[PDB]
């Protein structure tokens, strides 16, 4: 009151209401694990990118633009093709968890500004200020404080 001091005491003693503008902005500043050099990201199934996607055909977009008595509104060539591969691979034993565990972690990271394999700190605009959140350091109590108190108030 400095940055590592707040992570222990403000859970026990200090409320967020009695903190200055130079103290709130530095807790939203990135930590010392930021600016630490880290190679070798761990690859996973990217739910962001769609392998079954295709290109705008412009004759579908013309025919679907003229609204009326059409019965299917996409192409279905690449999305049937992909399904055939999953029928032919015979990969089941952990892929029964991969579609069913993995969606939950990457979907919650989309509400924090964090992409798929991003094990580091990513910002999130709350009001007029950015808050760098993590996979581990979610900083949820700062988010509940800055939304509720600084709705009609400004603390940089």
């Amino acid at each position: 009151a400095v940055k590592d001091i707040k992570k222990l005491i403000e859970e026990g003693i200090l409320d967020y209401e009695d903190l200055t503008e130079n103290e709130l902005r530095k807790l939203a500043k990135p930590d010392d694990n930021f600016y630490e050099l880290s190679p070798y990201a761990s690859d996973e199934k990217d739910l962001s990118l769609n392998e079954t996607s295709g290109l705008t055909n412009e004759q579908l977009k013309n025919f679907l633009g003229q609204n009326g008595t059409y019965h299917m509104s996409y192409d279905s060539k690449s999305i049937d093709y992909a399904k055939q591969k999953k029928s032919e691979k015979k990969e089941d034993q952990q892929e029964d968890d991969d579609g069913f565990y993995d969606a939950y972690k990457q979907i919650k990271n989309s509400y924090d500004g964090i992409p798929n394999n991003f094990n580091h700190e990513a910002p999130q605009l709350i009001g007029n200020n950015y808050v760098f959140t993590s996979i581990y350091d979610t900083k949820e109590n700062l988010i509940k404080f800055l939304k509720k108190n600084s709705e009609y108030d400004l603390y940089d």
């Binding site: 008595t69 019965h71 299917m72 279905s76």
Partner: protein, 191 residues
């Protein structure tokens, strides 16, 4: 001077070329395309009178069995009536037997073709149009579609536009999909 013939060549194409291009869309999209859809509607009426007395007689019995008395949307019932009429034209062009003579030959055509015709264009059927036409054929419920009241209206000299769901008599409750699907849960859930 030649500025006199400037405005004569100007207001020639100022008024000709817009009006020449408006008519190429007014005649095409407002005169051509509806007048063909009147002719090709009459080609279903000059031909195909004997077929559509029976086809609309069958199509009402799908709308009663797929829906099951839970108010039918009128706008896309007529949009799928056109796909049902394309199954009948495709079957009737493939028959030498008359429609009046042997009608259950045609339901093995028209239901089997619209089983396949709806399965190649309707992607997702939450009313289960393909899935119910499956078990009308694969459990042969289309027996009762031919009965004493259904052959009288079928043989009658009435135009097919006059065949309404008010004019078609309802099947008894033993003869519908609502009974036969619930009767399987009286067996298969119990067994």
């Amino acid at each position: 001077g030649y500025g006199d013939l400037a405005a004569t060549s100007a207001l020639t194409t100022v008024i000709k070329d817009p009006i020449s291009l408006t008519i190429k869309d007014i005649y095409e999209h407002g005169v051509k395309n509806p007048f063909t859809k009147i002719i090709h509607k009459l080609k279903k009426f000059i031909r195909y009178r004997k077929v559509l007395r029976w086809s609309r007689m069958w199509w009402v019995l799908l709308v009663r069995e797929i829906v099951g008395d839970n108010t039918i949307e009128k706008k896309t019932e007529k949009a799928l009536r056109e796909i049902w009429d394309q199954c009948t034209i495709a079957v009737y062009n493939n028959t030498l037997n008359a429609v009046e003579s042997k009608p259950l030959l045609f339901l093995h055509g028209i239901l089997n073709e619209c089983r396949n015709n709806f399965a190649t264009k309707l992607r997702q059927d939450p009313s289960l149009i393909v899935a119910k036409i499956d078990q009308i054929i694969k459990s042969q419920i289309y027996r009762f579609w031919v009965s004493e009241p259904y052959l009288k209206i079928g043989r009658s000299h009435t135009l097919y536009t006059h065949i309404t769901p008010d004019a078609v008599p309802q099947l008894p409750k033993e003869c519908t999909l609502k009974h036969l699907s619930s009767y399987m849960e009286e067996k298969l859930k119990s067994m």
